[PDB]
Write a protein that binds this ligand. Structure first.
Ligand SMILES: *[C@@H]1O[C@H](CO)[C@@H](O)[C@H](O)[C@H]1NC(C)=O
Ligand SMILES: *[C@@H]1O[C@H](CO)[C@@H](O)[C@H](O)[C@H]1NC(C)=O
Ligand SMILES: *[C@@H]1O[C@H](CO)[C@@H](O)[C@H](O)[C@H]1NC(C)=O
Ligand SMILES: *[C@@H]1O[C@H](CO)[C@@H](O)[C@H](O)[C@H]1NC(C)=O
Ligand SMILES: *[C@@H]1O[C@H](CO)[C@@H](O)[C@H](O)[C@H]1NC(C)=O
Ligand SMILES: *[C@@H]1O[C@H](CO)[C@@H](O)[C@H](O)[C@H]1NC(C)=O
Ligand SMILES: *[C@@H]1O[C@H](CO)[C@@H](O)[C@H](O)[C@H]1NC(C)=O
Ligand SMILES: *[C@@H]1O[C@H](CO)[C@@H](O)[C@H](O)[C@H]1NC(C)=O
Ligand SMILES: *[C@@H]1O[C@H](CO)[C@@H](O)[C@H](O)[C@H]1NC(C)=O
Ligand SMILES: *[C@@H]1O[C@H](CO)[C@@H](O)[C@H](O)[C@H]1NC(C)=O
Ligand SMILES: *[C@@H]1O[C@H](CO)[C@@H](O)[C@H](O)[C@H]1NC(C)=O
Ligand SMILES: *[C@@H]1O[C@H](CO)[C@@H](O)[C@H](O)[C@H]1NC(C)=O
Ligand SMILES: *[C@@H]1O[C@H](CO)[C@@H](O)[C@H](O)[C@H]1NC(C)=O
Ligand SMILES: *[C@@H]1O[C@H](CO)[C@@H](O)[C@H](O)[C@H]1NC(C)=O
Ligand SMILES: *[C@@H]1O[C@H](CO)[C@@H](O)[C@H](O)[C@H]1NC(C)=O
Lengths: 419, 413, 360, 149, 50
C-alpha cells in the first residue's frame, strides 16, 4: 500500500509561535514543452504511391485530401506562434557588461560563452545533450533556429541581471545586483538589511545551488521526461502511420503496384478502392490525434509564456507558481522543443519556539506591533519581523495604540520603552 | 490562384501541389530463358488421367504465351483466380503446374476454390487462396465411345474429405454401415470408384469434358516461367519507369551495398514496398528509391500590390531536381540579401522573405531585435524622472455561431 | 527421453530480404524451451508427425541418410522417400516399401534428383515441404542441443505434393538426433543490418514475451502493460433438441408427378427429420438455384424449427420474380417473398412434363 | 488588420460548413452522387448496395466536421475562461501580475463588447526620462548603518 | 472471441492496438490529475486533540 507522506503534528497552542532564525536560498528546475515536431504529409503520395489509376479513384472522395493538408498545416503553423509568444517577449536584444561584478553572484553557468560552437549557456548546452519515410511524409524546420532561441534566453537573462523587473515594465534601468536582491527580499516581507548583513553568505548559497543543478543534469536520466515524451510521441505516431501502408484492408495485396500488375481494370479497382478506404481512414486517425495533441501543447505553451512574464520578467505573490518557497527571481534556459526555468526561492530554516501575545498592556492602553509579532524569550519581550527572527526592543515607535486593555482576548502586561 | 479559388490573394506563402522528379524512360528486365513451354503436351495430349488420380505437369524454365489459350475458340470455360487472364503475358512465376483430368460437364462447377460435391469432396480439392486458372472444354469428339468409354473413373465414396491438393489412388472397400467389409464387397460395403461410360449420343451435361488447371507459383521468388514479353538494357542513378519479372515500379534505380542470401529475390521496406531487386540477367542487387518530391509552397506579395512571384520546393536540395538553396528548401525567383530586416513572410530556419525594390521577392535572415549593451556598474542606478500613461488594447474570442446539423437530413435528404 | 529445445526452432519465414527491423509473423514454429525427444545410435522407431516436425542430427560422418514419410507405410496408400548425399537428393513418391527395418548397406508418381565440429544439420517440415539449415558446432554434451540462438545457413526450401501423418529416419549400416513437433505461434523476429536473423521471441512462452510481442520490442522499460485477456476455448461440444431418425421426404416431394398453379401455391410443411440438401444443390436438373440468409454449401451443418416447401409452376420469364424484395405479377399477386427471406429457391424448366402432350 | 482573432474565429467556422456541404456532391465510388439516380436507375437490392456507399461517405464526412467543431469549441472555451479571468482581475481590480493586464504597470482596465468576443483597454504606467545617479546600499552616520525605509 | 473474425481483424494492422494506447493514456492521466490536486502537501499533518 503506497505511503502518502511522513507523519507530523504541529505543536499548536493558543499562546506559542515559531520563527525562523536562518534560511536556505534554493534553486529549482521547471520544464515545459513549448512546441512539437512540424510533420506534414502529402496525402495523395501517401494514399496512392504515384499511381494515376488510384488518383482517378481518390477524386471520387472529394475534399478529404485538401482538408487533411489544411489541418496539418494549421498545427505546423501555430508551432511558430507558440515559440514566438514564449521566448520573443523581450523587445531589444540586451547584453551584459564585460566583467562579472554581480555582488558575489556567479552567473557563468547560465550566461552565454562565445567559446562554444553554438552560443548556448553551459546549462543550455547540457540540456541539448539530454533530449535524444519517402511515403509523402516530411518534417518541416521551425521558424527560429536553436542558435536564435539561445539569443532570446540570453537577452532575457542579461536584461534580468542588469536591470531587474524594469525591462519588463518598458525600459532597462540599470541597478547594482545586490541592491536588486534587496528589493526582491523586501517583496517577501524580509526587511532588506537582512540581505546586506549576510550578502557574502547569500552569494555562497546561490553559487552552490546553481552548481547542484549542473550535477543533477550531468547524472539524472529521467530529468527531461516531459520533453522526451513529446519527442517520443511524434515518432510513435509517424511509425504507426507508415506501418499502416502494409495492411491489406481485405484487398488481395498490400502493394498497389502488385494489384495493377495482376488484375484488369474492373477487377483491380475493387481492390484499390478498398485500399483507398483503409489508407484514408488511417490518415484521418493520425490527423485527429495530432489536432488533439497540438491543443494540449498549446496549453503548455500558454503556461510557459505566463511563467516568462510573471516569474522571469517580475517577482510573483502567487504561492507555489514560480517554484516552492517564497519567489525571488527566475532565469529561463532553452531546451529541445521546450523551456526550462531556474527558479530562485527564499526558504526559511532553523526555527525557534517562543511565547507570544496579540497585544501588550501599558498605561491602560493596548499596544499592537506595526509590523511583525511580539515574542518572549521567557524573561523579556521583543518585536520581530514575521519571516526572520530579529529581536527589537518594544517601543512607542514600532507599535501603535487602540483603546483600553480589557477588550483583547489574551493581552499581556509588559512595559513599552519610550525613546 | 486556383488553389485558393480567388484571383485576389493576400500577402503570404501558400501550398499548391506536390512536385515530383519525372521518370525519364521505361526499363523492362526479364530472364533470357529462351525456349517455349510444352502446352501442346497438355491441351492437345493423346490421353487424359482419371479424376480420382489426376495428373500434375510442371511447367518451368521457359517462355510462354497465354494469349494463345485465352484467344482460342476451343475452351468452354476459362475461370481465373488471383490473376486476370488478359494480363497474364506481363507476369513471371517460379513454376506453373498444370493439373489434368476428365469429368462430366455437370461436374465443372465443382472445380473452384474450396468447393463441395463428389469431385471437390473426394477427387480434386482446390485451395481456398487459389492463384491460377481452370480451363475446361467438351471432349465428346475424342473421349466418348460407342457402348461407353469406361477408361475414366471417379471416387464416389470416402471416410473424410480431401485437404487442398491431397490426392488419393487407394482402393479399400468403403464401409457404408455397422457391417465390417474385411476385404470384400456386400450390403453396406462398396468399391470406392465409379466409371462414367461416356457414349457419344448422351446429353451435353453428361458428355465428357477435359479439364486443365494451371496453378501459378506466383511467389516473389526466382522466376522460371515468363510470358512472351521483351527485355531492355539496364540503367543506374537515374529516375525511370521499370518492370522486373512482372513487378512494376517507378523510381531511381541504383546499385547497392545490400547482400541478399541466395534464395531472396526482392528486398522490402517498413511500408512493405520493394526497395531492392536482384537483376534477373545480371545477379546484381539494385536498390530503389521513389524519385524526389515535396510541397510547392509559393511566396507571393498581395495580388492587388504585385503579381511577381517566388517558389519554395520544400526541404529538397536543387541537385536532386534567381535561385538559392536553404535548409528550408530549393528557393526560386527570390533574391538574396545580407541586411537582416524584420521578418515579413516566414520561410524557416531563420529565413524570411518580402517584396521590395529593381523589383523582386528578397530572401534574408530575420532580425531578432535591436541590440542593446546595458550600462551596469556596482554603484550606478537609473531612476525615471517622468512617465507616460499608455492604453494597450487586447482582443479575445468568447463564442462562435451556434450551429446544429440534423445528421439524418444531411445524410439522406 | 526428453531434453531442452532452447531457442533452436527459427527459420526465414519468406523469400524476401529485410534488414535492421523487427517483424511479427504467425506460422508453425518449434516453441522455445519445449521438450525435444532425443535418440542415439546403439535407433529409428516410427513416429507421429502432427502438424509439422523439427529434426536435427549431430553426427560424425553422414551416419543419418534420409527419411520415409506417409500414413500406413504398406503399399495400400501413398508415401514419400528421401535419400540424400549431404544436400544432393533422391526423392520419390510412391506406393513403395523397402525392407521394414529400413537402412542403407554401405510404383511411383513423382520423382526428383539433384568434437571440434559434430555438425548442426537441421531440418523442419510444413505440409510436405522441407526447410533445411546448417552450421558447425563444437560439443561436450552429446545428449543436448547448444543453447546459442541461430536460424542457420540456408540449404533447401522446396515444395512437392503428397499426404503424410507419420515418419521415420534412415541410417547407414555395415550419432545423436532430436525430434520436436511444431505448433502454431506468433514469433517476433529480429533482422540485422545484413538481413540475417539474429534473435526471436516466442510470444506464448511467458508474460514477459507476451509483453515484448505486444510492444513490438525486444527490451521493456519499467511499468505496467496491457497485453491479453482471460478467455477459454469450447472445451467440449454439446447438442440439444428433440432428437429424430426419419430421413426427410424431399426425395418423394421433388419426384412427385403433380404440381400447382402459382396463385394457389402449395405450402407443403416439412418437419421432424434428418435431411441432405447436397442431393438438391448438386442435381443438374435445376435450371436455377438461389439461397438467402444461408449458403447452399453450408446447409448440411444446420438445424431448423420447421421447413416449408412452397411449390408451384411459373413461365420461364417469371423465374426472376422468385426472390426477396422482388416485383412483378407473380411476386405481387400470386406469392410475395419477404424482404428478409431465409432459405433456398429451387427451380427447373418443366416443358417435358407440365407442357403435357397436345398442350396444357 | 486590427480584429484578426475574432475574424479568424468567424472564417474557420464558415470554411468548415462550406467544406461539409460540398462533400454532398462527391460520388464515394457510387454510380452517382445524387441519391435519386441510384433510386431510379436500379432494382432495390442493387440500389441499396449503392446507397450504402453514399451513407458511409456522407457519415464519415459529417463525423470529420463534428470532430473539428469539438476541438475548435475547446479552443474557444480556453479563451472564454481567460476573458472571464481578465474581467475579474483586470477590470474588477488592479493586478500585480506582470504583462497579464497589458505591458507596463497595470493601473486599471475597461471592457468593450465586440462581435463574438470582448476587447479590453488596459491603462498602464510606463516610466520614462531616466537620470543616472551614484548609489549606495546604506549610509554610515555616528558609526551606525542606516537603511532606507 | 471468434478466431475467424480475429484473423479478419488483423487485416486492419494496428487500429485495434493504437486505441488501447489512446485509452491507457487517458487512464494514467486520471491518476496524475488526482495526484496534482491533493498531493501538494508533503507531510501528513494531524491536529492536536483540543
Ligand atoms: C517547539 O515545541 C514542541 C513541544 O513539543 C517541540 O516538539 C518542537 O520540536 C519545538 N520546535 C522548535 C522549532 O523548537
Ligand atoms: C532574554 O533576553 C535578554 C536580552 O537579550 C537577556 O538579558 C535575558 O537573559 C534573556 N533570557 C533568557 C531566558 O535567555
Ligand atoms: C489560552 O489557554 C489558557 C488555558 O490553558 C487560558 O488561561 C488563556 O486565557 C488562553 N488564551 C487565549 C488567547 O485563548
Ligand atoms: C496588569 O497590571 C496592572 C497594574 O500593575 C494590574 O492591576 C493588573 O492586575 C495586571 N494584570 C492584568 C491581567 O491586568
Ligand atoms: C543472358 O545472355 C547473356 C549474353 O547475351 C549472358 O551473359 C547471360 O549469362 C545470359 N543469362 C543467363 C541466365 O545465363
Ligand atoms: C493595391 O495595389 C496598388 C498597386 O497595384 C496600390 O497602389 C494600392 O495602394 C493597393 N491598395 C490599397 C487598398 O492600398
Ligand atoms: C546539397 O546537396 C549536395 C549533394 O548533392 C551536398 O553536398 C550539400 O551539402 C547540400 N547543401 C547543403 C547546404 O548542405
Ligand atoms: C554580402 O556582404 C559582403 C560584404 O560584407 C559581400 O562581399 C557579399 O558579396 C554580399 N553578398 C550578397 C549576396 O549580397
Ligand atoms: C565596485 O567597483 C569599484 C571599481 O569601480 C571597486 O573598487 C570595488 O571593489 C567594487 N566593489 C564591489 C563589492 O564589487
Ligand atoms: C517437459 O516434460 C516434463 C516431464 O518429463 C514436464 O514436467 C514439463 O512440464 C515439460 N515441459 C514443458 C515446457 O511443459
Ligand atoms: C548419392 O550417392 C549414391 C552412391 O554413390 C549414388 O548412387 C546416387 O546417385 C547419389 N545421388 C545424388 C543425388 O548425389
Ligand atoms: C500403381 O499406381 C497407379 C496410379 O499411379 C495405380 O493405378 C495402380 O493400380 C498401381 N499399381 C498396382 C499394382 O496396383
Ligand atoms: C555486415 O556487413 C558488413 C560489411 O558490409 C560487415 O562489416 C559486418 O561485420 C557485418 N555484420 C554482421 C553482423 O553480419
Ligand atoms: C436421443 O437422445 C437419447 C439420450 O438423450 C439417446 O438415447 C437416443 O439414442 C437419441 N436418439 C437419436 C436419434 O439421436
Ligand atoms: C547613463 O550614462 C551612460 C554613460 O555612458 C549613458 O551611456 C547612458 O545613456 C545614460 N542613461 C540614460 C538613460 O541617460
Amino acid at each position: 500500500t503506497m505511503s502518502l507522506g511522513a507523519e507530523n503534528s504541529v505543536a499548536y497552542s493558543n499562546n506559542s509561535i515559531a520563527i525562523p532564525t536562518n534560511f536556505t536560498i534554493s534553486v529549482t528546475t521547471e520544464i515545459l514543452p513549448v512546441s512539437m515536431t512540424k510533420t506534414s504529409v502529402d496525402c495523395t503520395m501517401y494514399i496512392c504511391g504515384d499511381s494515376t489509376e488510384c488518383s482517378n479513384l481518390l477524386l471520387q472522395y472529394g475534399s478529404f485530401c485538401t482538408q487533411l493538408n489544411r489541418a496539418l498545416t494549421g498545427i505546423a503553423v501555430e508551432q511558430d506562434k507558440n515559440t514566438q509568444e514564449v521566448f520573443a517577449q523581450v523587445k531589444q536584444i540586451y547584453k551584459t557588461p564585460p566583467i562579472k561584478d554581480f555582488g558575489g553572484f556567479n552567473f557563468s553557468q547560465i550566461l552565454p560563452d562565445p567559446s562554444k560552437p553554438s552560443k548556448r549557456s553551459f546549462i543550455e548546452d547540457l540540456l541539448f545533450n539530454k533530449v535524444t519515410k519517402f511515403n509523402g511524409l516530411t518534417v518541416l524546420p521551425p521558424l527560429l533556429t536553436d542558435e536564435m532561441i539561445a539569443q532570446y534566453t540570453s537577452a532575457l537573462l542579461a536584461g534580468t541581471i542588469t536591470s531587474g523587473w524594469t525591462f519588463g515594465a518598458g525600459a532597462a534601468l540599470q541597478i547594482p545586483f545586490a541592491m536588486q536582491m534587496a528589493y526582491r527580499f523586501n517583496g517577501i516581507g524580509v526587511t532588506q538589511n537582512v540581505l546586506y548583513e549576510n550578502q557574502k553568505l547569500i552569494a555562497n548559497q546561490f553559487n552552490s545551488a546553481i552548481g547542484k543543478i549542473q550535477d543533477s543534469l550531468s547524472s539524472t536520466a529521467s530529468a527531461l521526461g516531459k520533453l522526451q515524451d513529446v519527442v517520443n510521441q511524434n515518432a510513435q505516431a509517424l511509425n504507426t502511420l507508415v506501418k499502416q501502408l502494409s495492411s491489406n484492408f481485405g484487398a488481395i495485396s498490400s502493394v498497389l503496384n502488385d494489384i495493377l500488375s495482376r488484375l484488369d481494370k474492373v477487377e483491380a479497382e475493387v481492390q484499390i478502392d478498398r485500399l483507398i478506404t483503409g489508407r484514408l481512414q488511417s490518415l484521418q486517425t493520425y490527423v485527429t490525434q495530432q489536432l488533439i495533441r497540438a491543443a494540449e501543447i498549446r496549453a503548455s505553451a500558454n503556461l510557459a509564456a505566463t511563467k516568462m512574464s510573471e516569474c522571469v520578467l517580475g517577482q510573483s505573490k502567487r504561492v507555489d507558481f514560480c517554484g516552492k518557497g517564497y519567489h525571488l527571481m527566475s532565469f529561463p534556459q532553452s531546451a529541445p522543443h521546450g523551456v526550462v526555468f531556474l527558479h530562485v526561492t527564499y526558504v526559511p530554516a532553523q526555527e525557534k519556539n517562543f511565547t507570544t501575545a496579540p497585544a501588550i498592556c501599558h498605561d491602560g492602553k493596548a499596544h499592537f506591533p506595526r509590523e511583525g509579532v511580539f515574542v518572549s524569550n521567557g524573561t523579556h519581550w521583543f518585536v520581530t519581523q514575521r519571516n526572520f527572527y530579529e529581536p527589537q526592543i518594544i517601543t512607542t515607535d514600532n507599535t501603535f495604540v487602540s483603546g483600553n486593555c480589557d477588550v483583547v482576548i489574551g493581552i499581556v502586561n509588559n512595559t513599552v520603552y519610550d525613546p | 490562384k486556383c488553389t485558393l479559388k480567388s484571383f485576389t490573394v493576400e500577402k503570404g506563402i501558400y501550398q499548391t501541389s506536390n512536385f515530383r522528379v519525372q521518370p525519364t524512360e521505361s526499363i523492362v528486365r526479364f530472364p533470357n530463358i529462351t525456349n517455349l513451354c510444352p502446352f501442346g503436351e497438355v491441351f492437345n495430349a493423346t490421353r487424359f488421367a482419371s479424376v480420382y488420380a489426376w495428373n500434375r505437369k510442371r511447367i518451368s524454365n521457359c517462355v510462354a504465351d497465354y494469349s494463345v489459350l485465352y484467344n482460342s475458340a476451343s475452351f468452354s470455360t476459362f475461370k481465373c483466380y488471383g490473376v486476370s487472364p488478359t494480363k497474364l503475358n506481363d507476369l513471371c512465376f517460379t513454376n506453373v503446374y498444370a493439373d489434368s483430368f476428365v469429368i462430366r460437364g455437370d461436374e465443372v462447377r465443382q472445380i473452384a476454390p474450396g468447393q463441395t460435391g463428389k469431385i471437390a469432396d473426394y477427387n480434386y480439392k482446390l485451395p481456398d487462396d487459389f492463384t491460377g486458372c481452370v480451363i475446361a472444354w467438351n471432349s465428346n469428339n475424342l473421349d466418348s465411345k460407342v457402348g461407353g468409354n469406361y477408361n475414366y473413373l471417379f471416387r464416389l465414396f470416402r471416410k473424410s474429405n480431401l485437404k487442398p491438393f491431397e490426392r488419393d489412388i487407394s482402393t479399400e472397400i468403403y464401409q457404408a454401415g455397422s457391417t465390417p467389409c474385411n476385404g470384400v464387397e456386400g450390403f453396406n460395403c462398396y468399391f470406392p470408384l465409379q466409371s462414367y461410360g461416356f457414349q457419344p449420343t448422351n446429353g451435353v451435361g453428361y458428355q465428357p469434358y477435359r479439364v486443365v488447371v494451371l496453378s501459378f507459383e506466383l511467389l516473389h521468388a526466382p522466376a522460371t516461367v515468363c510470358g512472351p514479353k521483351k527485355s531492355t538494357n539496364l540503367v543506374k542513378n537515374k529516375c525511370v519507369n521499370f518492370n522486373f519479372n512482372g513487378l512494376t515500379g517507378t523510381g531511381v534505380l541504383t546499385e547497392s551495398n545490400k547482400k541478399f542470401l541466395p534464395f531472396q529475390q526482392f528486398g522490402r521496406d517498413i511500408a512493405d514496398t520493394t526497395d531492392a531487386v536482384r537483376d534477373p540477367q545480371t545477379l546484381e542487387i539494385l536498390d530503389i528509391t521513389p524519385c524526389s518530391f515535396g510541397g510547392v509552397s509559393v511566396i507571393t506579395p498581395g495580388t492587388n500590390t504585385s503579381n511577381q512571384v517566388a517558389v519554395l520546393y520544400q526541404g529538397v536540395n536543387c541537385t536532386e531536381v534567381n535561385v538559392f538553396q536553404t535548409r528550408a528548401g530549393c528557393l526560386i525567383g527570390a533574391e538574396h540579401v545580407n541586411n537582416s530586416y524584420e521578418c515579413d513572410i516566414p520561410i524557416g530556419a531563420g529565413i524570411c522573405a518580402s517584396y521590395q525594390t529593381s523589383q523582386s521577392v528578397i530572401a534574408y535572415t530575420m532580425s531578432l531585435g535591436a541590440e542593446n549593451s546595458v550600462a551596469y556598474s556596482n554603484n550606478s542606478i537609473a531612476i525615471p524622472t517622468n512617465f507616460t500613461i499608455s492604453v494597450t488594447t487586447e482582443i479575445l474570442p468568447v463564442s462562435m455561431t451556434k450551429t446544429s446539423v440534423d445528421c439524418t437530413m444531411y445524410i439522406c435528404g | 527421453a526428453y531434453t531442452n529445445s532452447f531457442t533452436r526452432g527459427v527459420y526465414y519465414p519468406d523469400k524476401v530480404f529485410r534488414s535492421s527491423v523487427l517483424h511479427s509473423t504467425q506460422d508453425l514454429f518449434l516453441p522455445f524451451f519445449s521438450n525435444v525427444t532425443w535418440f542415439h545410435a546403439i535407433d529409428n522407431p516410427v513416429l507421429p508427425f502432427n502438424d509439422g516436425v523439427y529434426f536435427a542430427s549431430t553426427e560424425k560422418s553422414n551416419i543419418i541418410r534420409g527419411w520415409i514419410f506417409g500414413t500406413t507405410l504398406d503399399s495400400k496408400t501413398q508415401s514419400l522417400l528421401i535419400v540424400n548425399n549431404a544436400t544432393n537428393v533422391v526423392i520419390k513418391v510412391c506406393e513403395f516399401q523397402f525392407c521394414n527395418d529400413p537402412f542403407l548397406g554401405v510404383n511411383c508418381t513423382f520423382e526428383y534428383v539433384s568434437f571440434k565440429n559434430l555438425r548442426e544439420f537441421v531440418f523442419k517440415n510444413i505440409d510436405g515441404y522441407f526447410k533445411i539449415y546448417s552450421k558447425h558446432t563444437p560439443i561436450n554434451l552429446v545428449r543436448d542441443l547448444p543453447q546459442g540462438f541461430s536460424a542457420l545457413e540456408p540449404l533447401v526450401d522446396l515444395p512437392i505434393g503428397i499426404n503424410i501423418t507419420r515418419f521415420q529416419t534412415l541410417l547407414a549400416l555395415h550419432a545423436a538426433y532430436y525430434v520436436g513437433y511444431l505448433q502454431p505461434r506468433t514469433f517476433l523476429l529480429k533482422y540485422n543490418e545484413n538481413g540475417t536473423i539474429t534473435d526471436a521471441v516466442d510470444c506464448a512462452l511467458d508474460p514477459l514475451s507476451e509483453t515484448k510481442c505486444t510492444l513490438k520490442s525486444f527490451t521493456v522499460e519499467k511499468g505496467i502493460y496491457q497485453t491479453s485477456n482471460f478467455r477459454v476455448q469450447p472445451t467440449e461440444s454439446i447438442v440439444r433438441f428433440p432428437n429424430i431418425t426419419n430421413l426427410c421426404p424431399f426425395g418423394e416431394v421433388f419426384n412427385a408427378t403433380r404440381f400447382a398453379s402459382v396463385y394457389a401455391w402449395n405450402r407443403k410443411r416439412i418437419s421432424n427429420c434428418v435431411a441432405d440438401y447436397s442431393v438438391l444443390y448438386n442435381s443438374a436438373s435445376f435450371s436455377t438455384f438461389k439461397c438467402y440468409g444461408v449458403s447452399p454449401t453450408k446447409l448440411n451443418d444446420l438445424c431448423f424449427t420447421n421447413v416449408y416447401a412452397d411449390s408451384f409452376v411459373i413461365r420461364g420469364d417469371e423465374v426472376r420474380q422468385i426472390a426477396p424484395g422482388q416485383t412483378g405479377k407473380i411476386a405481387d399477386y400470386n406469392y410475395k417473398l419477404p424482404d428478409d427471406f431465409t432459405g433456398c429457391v429451387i427451380a427447373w424448366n418443366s416443358n417435358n412434363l407440365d407442357s403435357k402432350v397436345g398442350g396444357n
